[PDB]
RNA sequence: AACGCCCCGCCGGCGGAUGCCUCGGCCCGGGCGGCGACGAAGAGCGCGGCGGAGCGCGAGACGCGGUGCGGACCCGCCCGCCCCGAGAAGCACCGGCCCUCGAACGCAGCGCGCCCCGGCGCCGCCGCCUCGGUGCCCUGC
């Protein structure tokens, strides 16, 4: 149950916020769970999805694995190579089938200096959280 | 007869009710209470690579600069970016640019002056400079 009176629980307001979010909020809302092996390596659960990493689709009619080749931020959809609509002819450029990030698992992440710094920033902040509860 | 017209059992039109759904309205509470001659509110006309309306902006024009945060895209076609910082989208604050009308300020509204050096509106308060008066006096003549 919510106790913060400054946060709205109105359906109309929540949906309006969802449909008119700015760029960074949209990016954060497009996260996927990390695999068990990646969870052990970095002590985090989810990661914003980015072009260049590998995912596994675990639900829907287009299950599979592939590399992320495009992010459509104003639809909340991604295109992964090899997941296409069935073609009318064998000679036509494939049409990707857009997929929501919340039904895939990240298998391997494309690594940057900025990604490293962001992950390290994340870990050092839930370390305080864990130190402040339990143990 | 037959056709035409009017009434059942299937299939088509025309029209847009109904049902379900809605980033919209309306009411109640809380906060705030901040414009302008340092040129406001409002109006006009312009500004995009391919650009009509709307938003935004002002010849530095569909934006420029600084400081922080952010971290891969940029609705089409293009161009660009890609990196342990090398920087796309976004966000906050600060500094500037700011055409013509408008309280609207050389006159007038699209034309024309004065001036000598650059500048030339009104009203008020304070102060200064230059002056007037058979006002009240005084001196000299
Ligand atoms: Mg236009
Ligand atoms: Mg004028
Ligand atoms: Mg005038």
mmCIF file of C-alpha atoms (C1' of nucleotides) and ligand atoms in Angstrom:
data_model
loop_
_atom_site.group_PDB
_atom_site.id
_atom_site.type_symbol
_atom_site.label_atom_id
_atom_site.label_comp_id
_atom_site.label_asym_id
_atom_site.label_seq_id
_atom_site.Cartn_x
_atom_site.Cartn_y
_atom_site.Cartn_z
ATOM 1 C CA UNK A 1 0.000 0.000 0.000
ATOM 2 C CA UNK A 2 1.258 3.443 -1.004
ATOM 3 C CA UNK A 3 1.817 6.046 1.710
ATOM 4 C CA UNK A 4 3.493 8.856 -0.266
ATOM 5 C CA UNK A 5 0.663 11.308 -0.920
ATOM 6 C CA UNK A 6 2.726 13.105 -3.593
ATOM 7 C CA UNK A 7 2.663 10.081 -5.946
ATOM 8 C CA UNK A 8 -0.515 9.609 -7.954
ATOM 9 C CA UNK A 9 -2.447 6.346 -8.208
ATOM 10 C CA UNK A 10 -4.822 7.641 -10.898
ATOM 11 C CA UNK A 11 -5.144 5.373 -13.929
ATOM 12 C CA UNK A 12 -5.545 8.295 -16.332
ATOM 13 C CA UNK A 13 -2.442 10.056 -14.977
ATOM 14 C CA UNK A 14 -0.320 6.889 -14.959
ATOM 15 C CA UNK A 15 -1.229 6.112 -18.566
ATOM 16 C CA UNK A 16 -0.574 9.706 -19.629
ATOM 17 C CA UNK A 17 2.860 9.552 -18.008
ATOM 18 C CA UNK A 18 3.549 6.286 -19.822
ATOM 19 C CA UNK A 19 2.559 7.663 -23.232
ATOM 20 C CA UNK A 20 4.475 10.953 -22.981
ATOM 21 C CA UNK A 21 7.690 10.094 -21.165
ATOM 22 C CA UNK A 22 10.906 11.812 -22.202
ATOM 23 C CA UNK A 23 13.986 10.011 -23.533
ATOM 24 C CA UNK A 24 15.728 8.853 -20.348
ATOM 25 C CA UNK A 25 12.538 7.613 -18.698
ATOM 26 C CA UNK A 26 11.730 5.666 -21.855
ATOM 27 C CA UNK A 27 15.215 4.162 -21.843
ATOM 28 C CA UNK A 28 14.877 3.084 -18.209
ATOM 29 C CA UNK A 29 11.434 1.551 -18.791
ATOM 30 C CA UNK A 30 12.984 -0.747 -21.441
ATOM 31 C CA UNK A 31 14.925 -3.093 -19.170
ATOM 32 C CA UNK A 32 15.392 -6.856 -19.281
ATOM 33 C CA UNK A 33 16.410 -9.438 -16.717
ATOM 34 C CA UNK A 34 19.979 -10.730 -16.722
ATOM 35 C CA UNK A 35 20.816 -14.412 -16.958
ATOM 36 C CA UNK A 36 21.803 -16.390 -13.873
ATOM 37 C CA UNK A 37 25.457 -16.478 -14.944
ATOM 38 C CA UNK A 38 25.524 -12.710 -15.472
ATOM 39 C CA UNK A 39 23.741 -12.174 -12.154
ATOM 40 C CA UNK A 40 26.575 -13.949 -10.350
ATOM 41 C CA UNK A 41 29.266 -11.928 -12.134
ATOM 42 C CA UNK A 42 27.654 -8.538 -11.434
ATOM 43 C CA UNK A 43 25.370 -8.294 -8.407
ATOM 44 C CA UNK A 44 22.448 -6.715 -10.272
ATOM 45 C CA UNK A 45 19.128 -8.057 -11.525
ATOM 46 C CA UNK A 46 18.090 -5.978 -14.564
ATOM 47 C CA UNK A 47 19.826 -3.815 -17.159
ATOM 48 C CA UNK A 48 18.586 -1.254 -19.703
ATOM 49 C CA UNK A 49 18.580 -2.791 -23.168
ATOM 50 C CA UNK A 50 21.009 -1.438 -25.745
ATOM 51 C CA UNK A 51 21.980 -2.067 -29.347
ATOM 52 C CA UNK A 52 24.654 -4.732 -29.720
ATOM 53 C CA UNK A 53 23.934 -7.262 -26.956
ATOM 54 C CA UNK A 54 22.519 -10.788 -27.141
ATOM 55 C CA UNK A 55 19.126 -11.865 -25.808
ATOM 56 C CA UNK A 56 17.018 -15.012 -25.571
ATOM 57 C CA UNK A 57 13.257 -14.770 -26.111
ATOM 58 C CA UNK A 58 11.453 -16.944 -23.561
ATOM 59 C CA UNK A 59 7.792 -16.269 -24.378
ATOM 60 C CA UNK A 60 5.593 -15.658 -27.401
ATOM 61 C CA UNK A 61 5.337 -17.158 -30.852
ATOM 62 C CA UNK A 62 8.812 -15.982 -31.916
ATOM 63 C CA UNK A 63 11.116 -17.636 -29.393
ATOM 64 C CA UNK A 64 14.809 -17.652 -30.229
ATOM 65 C CA UNK A 65 18.199 -16.041 -29.720
ATOM 66 C CA UNK A 66 19.937 -13.237 -31.555
ATOM 67 C CA UNK A 67 21.692 -9.898 -31.507
ATOM 68 C CA UNK A 68 19.865 -6.612 -30.996
ATOM 69 C CA UNK A 69 20.087 -4.539 -34.176
ATOM 70 C CA UNK A 70 17.620 -1.696 -33.556
ATOM 71 C CA UNK A 71 15.735 -0.021 -30.709
ATOM 72 C CA UNK A 72 12.401 1.682 -31.435
ATOM 73 C CA UNK A 73 12.064 3.906 -28.393
ATOM 74 C CA UNK A 74 8.697 5.465 -29.241
ATOM 75 C CA UNK A 75 7.059 2.042 -29.498
ATOM 76 C CA UNK A 76 8.918 0.291 -26.654
ATOM 77 C CA UNK A 77 10.006 -2.413 -29.102
ATOM 78 C CA UNK A 78 13.278 -3.919 -30.305
ATOM 79 C CA UNK A 79 14.375 -5.816 -33.403
ATOM 80 C CA UNK A 80 16.668 -8.834 -33.046
ATOM 81 C CA UNK A 81 18.359 -10.377 -36.062
ATOM 82 C CA UNK A 82 16.651 -13.491 -37.385
ATOM 83 C CA UNK A 83 13.173 -12.876 -35.949
ATOM 84 C CA UNK A 84 11.137 -11.801 -38.964
ATOM 85 C CA UNK A 85 7.675 -11.821 -40.443
ATOM 86 C CA UNK A 86 7.286 -14.607 -42.985
ATOM 87 C CA UNK A 87 8.109 -13.357 -46.470
ATOM 88 C CA UNK A 88 5.911 -13.437 -49.558
ATOM 89 C CA UNK A 89 8.919 -14.239 -51.774
ATOM 90 C CA UNK A 90 12.346 -15.703 -50.957
ATOM 91 C CA UNK A 91 14.065 -12.700 -52.570
ATOM 92 C CA UNK A 92 12.765 -9.865 -50.362
ATOM 93 C CA UNK A 93 14.594 -8.092 -47.570
ATOM 94 C CA UNK A 94 13.337 -9.491 -44.240
ATOM 95 C CA UNK A 95 10.846 -7.561 -42.126
ATOM 96 C CA UNK A 96 11.715 -7.831 -38.410
ATOM 97 C CA UNK A 97 9.033 -8.674 -35.885
ATOM 98 C CA UNK A 98 9.199 -6.125 -33.037
ATOM 99 C CA UNK A 99 9.530 -7.584 -29.544
ATOM 100 C CA UNK A 100 8.939 -6.085 -26.116
ATOM 101 C CA UNK A 101 12.074 -6.054 -23.918
ATOM 102 C CA UNK A 102 10.220 -7.522 -20.932
ATOM 103 C CA UNK A 103 9.982 -10.998 -22.493
ATOM 104 C CA UNK A 104 13.672 -11.609 -23.163
ATOM 105 C CA UNK A 105 16.748 -12.380 -21.066
ATOM 106 C CA UNK A 106 20.146 -10.768 -21.633
ATOM 107 C CA UNK A 107 22.787 -13.413 -22.345
ATOM 108 C CA UNK A 108 25.768 -11.129 -22.988
ATOM 109 C CA UNK A 109 26.088 -7.350 -22.764
ATOM 110 C CA UNK A 110 27.910 -5.024 -25.141
ATOM 111 C CA UNK A 111 30.547 -3.409 -22.949
ATOM 112 C CA UNK A 112 31.633 0.226 -22.842
ATOM 113 C CA UNK A 113 33.582 2.445 -20.506
ATOM 114 C CA UNK A 114 30.304 4.152 -19.647
ATOM 115 C CA UNK A 115 28.545 0.821 -19.092
ATOM 116 C CA UNK A 116 31.320 -0.282 -16.737
ATOM 117 C CA UNK A 117 31.071 2.949 -14.768
ATOM 118 C CA UNK A 118 27.275 2.711 -14.574
ATOM 119 C CA UNK A 119 27.386 -0.881 -13.328
ATOM 120 C CA UNK A 120 30.011 -0.022 -10.727
ATOM 121 C CA UNK A 121 27.865 2.916 -9.622
ATOM 122 C CA UNK A 122 24.901 0.555 -9.231
ATOM 123 C CA UNK A 123 26.782 -2.004 -7.138
ATOM 124 C CA UNK A 124 28.231 0.498 -4.680
ATOM 125 C CA UNK A 125 24.734 1.837 -3.930
ATOM 126 C CA UNK A 126 22.932 -1.382 -3.053
ATOM 127 C CA UNK A 127 25.956 -2.337 -0.969
ATOM 128 C CA UNK A 128 24.862 0.398 1.432
ATOM 129 C CA UNK A 129 21.296 -0.876 1.162
ATOM 130 C CA UNK A 130 22.359 -4.395 2.145
ATOM 131 C CA UNK A 131 24.536 -3.042 4.951
ATOM 132 C CA UNK A 132 21.555 -1.050 6.265
ATOM 133 C CA UNK A 133 19.220 -4.071 6.546
ATOM 134 C CA UNK A 134 19.796 -7.505 8.014
ATOM 135 C CA UNK A 135 23.001 -9.375 8.757
ATOM 136 C "C1'" A B 1 -53.731 -14.249 -66.576
ATOM 137 C "C1'" A B 2 -49.153 -11.789 -66.581
ATOM 138 C "C1'" C B 3 -46.867 -7.633 -64.585
ATOM 139 C "C1'" G B 4 -46.844 -4.014 -60.918
ATOM 140 C "C1'" C B 5 -48.033 -3.645 -55.537
ATOM 141 C "C1'" C B 6 -48.147 -5.799 -50.695
ATOM 142 C "C1'" C B 7 -46.631 -10.263 -47.095
ATOM 143 C "C1'" C B 8 -42.152 -15.442 -45.717
ATOM 144 C "C1'" G B 9 -37.067 -18.447 -45.882
ATOM 145 C "C1'" C B 10 -31.779 -17.395 -47.676
ATOM 146 C "C1'" C B 11 -28.074 -13.715 -49.801
ATOM 147 C "C1'" G B 12 -26.585 -8.398 -50.921
ATOM 148 C "C1'" G B 13 -26.802 -2.806 -50.394
ATOM 149 C "C1'" C B 14 -27.634 2.089 -47.709
ATOM 150 C "C1'" G B 15 -27.054 4.141 -42.984
ATOM 151 C "C1'" G B 16 -24.975 4.537 -38.550
ATOM 152 C "C1'" A B 17 -27.750 3.159 -33.427
ATOM 153 C "C1'" U B 18 -26.090 -0.185 -29.680
ATOM 154 C "C1'" G B 19 -22.098 -2.501 -26.645
ATOM 155 C "C1'" C B 20 -17.203 -2.167 -25.098
ATOM 156 C "C1'" C B 21 -13.038 1.372 -24.841
ATOM 157 C "C1'" U B 22 -10.946 6.472 -24.141
ATOM 158 C "C1'" C B 23 -3.403 10.922 -23.205
ATOM 159 C "C1'" G B 24 -10.440 14.763 -22.636
ATOM 160 C "C1'" G B 25 -13.975 17.408 -19.379
ATOM 161 C "C1'" C B 26 -16.334 18.832 -14.507
ATOM 162 C "C1'" C B 27 -16.267 19.340 -9.150
ATOM 163 C "C1'" C B 28 -13.545 19.457 -4.192
ATOM 164 C "C1'" G B 29 -8.838 20.356 -1.424
ATOM 165 C "C1'" G B 30 -3.791 22.290 -1.171
ATOM 166 C "C1'" G B 31 0.128 25.640 -2.865
ATOM 167 C "C1'" C B 32 1.493 30.007 -5.224
ATOM 168 C "C1'" G B 33 0.607 34.957 -5.695
ATOM 169 C "C1'" G B 34 5.807 36.415 -9.738
ATOM 170 C "C1'" C B 35 4.599 41.857 -15.439
ATOM 171 C "C1'" G B 36 6.434 46.953 -17.499
ATOM 172 C "C1'" A B 37 10.586 53.046 -20.438
ATOM 173 C "C1'" C B 38 16.667 47.685 -18.269
ATOM 174 C "C1'" G B 39 10.508 48.536 -23.325
ATOM 175 C "C1'" A B 40 5.353 44.659 -20.824
ATOM 176 C "C1'" A B 41 0.624 42.199 -22.535
ATOM 177 C "C1'" G B 42 -0.688 42.041 -27.602
ATOM 178 C "C1'" A B 43 -0.068 42.281 -33.155
ATOM 179 C "C1'" G B 44 2.712 41.900 -37.880
ATOM 180 C "C1'" C B 45 6.579 39.848 -40.860
ATOM 181 C "C1'" G B 46 10.500 36.387 -41.209
ATOM 182 C "C1'" C B 47 13.726 31.729 -39.757
ATOM 183 C "C1'" G B 48 14.264 24.425 -41.286
ATOM 184 C "C1'" G B 49 18.923 20.283 -46.320
ATOM 185 C "C1'" C B 50 14.345 18.548 -48.932
ATOM 186 C "C1'" G B 51 9.111 22.791 -45.112
ATOM 187 C "C1'" G B 52 2.107 24.009 -45.784
ATOM 188 C "C1'" A B 53 -0.699 24.531 -40.677
ATOM 189 C "C1'" G B 54 0.639 24.391 -35.149
ATOM 190 C "C1'" C B 55 4.824 24.818 -31.411
ATOM 191 C "C1'" G B 56 9.347 27.303 -31.017
ATOM 192 C "C1'" C B 57 12.628 31.055 -32.183
ATOM 193 C "C1'" G B 58 14.503 36.548 -34.104
ATOM 194 C "C1'" A B 59 19.158 38.514 -39.564
ATOM 195 C "C1'" G B 60 23.706 34.933 -33.946
ATOM 196 C "C1'" A B 61 16.344 33.128 -36.250
ATOM 197 C "C1'" C B 62 12.930 25.366 -36.329
ATOM 198 C "C1'" G B 63 18.549 28.281 -32.199
ATOM 199 C "C1'" C B 64 24.338 30.186 -29.838
ATOM 200 C "C1'" G B 65 27.603 29.734 -25.243
ATOM 201 C "C1'" G B 66 28.923 28.030 -19.783
ATOM 202 C "C1'" U B 67 28.425 24.656 -15.610
ATOM 203 C "C1'" G B 68 26.510 19.888 -13.835
ATOM 204 C "C1'" C B 69 23.781 15.128 -14.806
ATOM 205 C "C1'" G B 70 22.861 11.300 -18.800
ATOM 206 C "C1'" G B 71 25.112 7.496 -21.906
ATOM 207 C "C1'" A B 72 23.542 5.458 -27.978
ATOM 208 C "C1'" C B 73 20.886 7.060 -31.027
ATOM 209 C "C1'" C B 74 18.893 10.472 -34.504
ATOM 210 C "C1'" C B 75 9.929 9.790 -36.522
ATOM 211 C "C1'" G B 76 10.999 9.658 -43.825
ATOM 212 C "C1'" C B 77 15.475 10.123 -47.263
ATOM 213 C "C1'" C B 78 20.039 12.000 -45.997
ATOM 214 C "C1'" C B 79 23.984 13.867 -42.878
ATOM 215 C "C1'" G B 80 26.196 12.866 -38.268
ATOM 216 C "C1'" C B 81 27.943 10.131 -33.606
ATOM 217 C "C1'" C B 82 30.591 5.247 -32.275
ATOM 218 C "C1'" C B 83 36.505 4.436 -28.478
ATOM 219 C "C1'" C B 84 37.508 4.059 -20.516
ATOM 220 C "C1'" G B 85 35.379 9.796 -22.930
ATOM 221 C "C1'" A B 86 36.284 10.639 -27.857
ATOM 222 C "C1'" G B 87 29.745 11.979 -26.747
ATOM 223 C "C1'" A B 88 23.556 10.871 -30.023
ATOM 224 C "C1'" A B 89 18.711 11.507 -27.533
ATOM 225 C "C1'" G B 90 17.203 13.865 -22.894
ATOM 226 C "C1'" C B 91 17.207 17.192 -18.069
ATOM 227 C "C1'" A B 92 18.353 21.572 -14.688
ATOM 228 C "C1'" C B 93 20.297 26.246 -13.853
ATOM 229 C "C1'" C B 94 23.164 30.505 -15.649
ATOM 230 C "C1'" G B 95 25.097 34.264 -19.909
ATOM 231 C "C1'" G B 96 23.951 36.552 -24.302
ATOM 232 C "C1'" C B 97 21.380 37.665 -29.300
ATOM 233 C "C1'" C B 98 16.568 39.900 -29.675
ATOM 234 C "C1'" C B 99 13.497 42.769 -37.140
ATOM 235 C "C1'" U B 100 8.521 46.468 -37.531
ATOM 236 C "C1'" C B 101 4.187 48.260 -34.680
ATOM 237 C "C1'" G B 102 2.507 48.608 -29.605
ATOM 238 C "C1'" A B 103 2.250 52.678 -22.635
ATOM 239 C "C1'" A B 104 5.500 53.591 -27.723
ATOM 240 C "C1'" C B 105 9.416 58.463 -27.267
ATOM 241 C "C1'" G B 106 12.652 63.600 -33.679
ATOM 242 C "C1'" C B 107 7.604 64.243 -37.082
ATOM 243 C "C1'" A B 108 4.550 60.666 -39.870
ATOM 244 C "C1'" G B 109 3.025 55.633 -41.053
ATOM 245 C "C1'" C B 110 5.963 53.467 -44.717
ATOM 246 C "C1'" G B 111 7.156 59.040 -46.255
ATOM 247 C "C1'" C B 112 10.508 63.223 -44.321
ATOM 248 C "C1'" G B 113 13.481 66.478 -41.128
ATOM 249 C "C1'" C B 114 16.998 69.322 -37.515
ATOM 250 C "C1'" C B 115 21.907 68.960 -35.855
ATOM 251 C "C1'" C B 116 28.289 71.137 -35.701
ATOM 252 C "C1'" C B 117 31.064 67.074 -33.507
ATOM 253 C "C1'" G B 118 25.850 62.422 -31.740
ATOM 254 C "C1'" G B 119 22.160 62.694 -31.050
ATOM 255 C "C1'" C B 120 17.156 64.812 -31.101
ATOM 256 C "C1'" G B 121 9.323 62.813 -26.724
ATOM 257 C "C1'" C B 122 6.214 64.319 -22.203
ATOM 258 C "C1'" C B 123 5.213 65.284 -16.823
ATOM 259 C "C1'" G B 124 7.395 65.527 -11.707
ATOM 260 C "C1'" C B 125 11.251 65.991 -7.530
ATOM 261 C "C1'" C B 126 16.154 67.500 -6.152
ATOM 262 C "C1'" G B 127 20.554 70.220 -7.656
ATOM 263 C "C1'" C B 128 23.196 73.391 -10.826
ATOM 264 C "C1'" C B 129 24.000 77.163 -14.996
ATOM 265 C "C1'" U B 130 22.067 81.509 -17.659
ATOM 266 C "C1'" C B 131 18.446 85.394 -17.127
ATOM 267 C "C1'" G B 132 13.540 88.870 -16.274
ATOM 268 C "C1'" G B 133 10.473 92.336 -12.939
ATOM 269 C "C1'" U B 134 7.899 101.128 -12.614
ATOM 270 C "C1'" G B 135 8.014 93.613 -6.317
ATOM 271 C "C1'" C B 136 10.704 95.238 -1.331
ATOM 272 C "C1'" C B 137 15.259 97.696 -0.594
ATOM 273 C "C1'" C B 138 20.167 99.685 -1.016
ATOM 274 C "C1'" U B 139 24.323 101.983 -2.979
ATOM 275 C "C1'" G B 140 26.809 104.758 -6.185
ATOM 276 C "C1'" C B 141 25.362 108.485 -10.604
HETATM 277 MG MG1 LIG C 1 4.685 26.409 -40.746
HETATM 278 MG MG1 LIG C 2 8.776 54.327 -33.033
HETATM 279 MG MG1 LIG C 3 4.572 58.788 -33.169
#
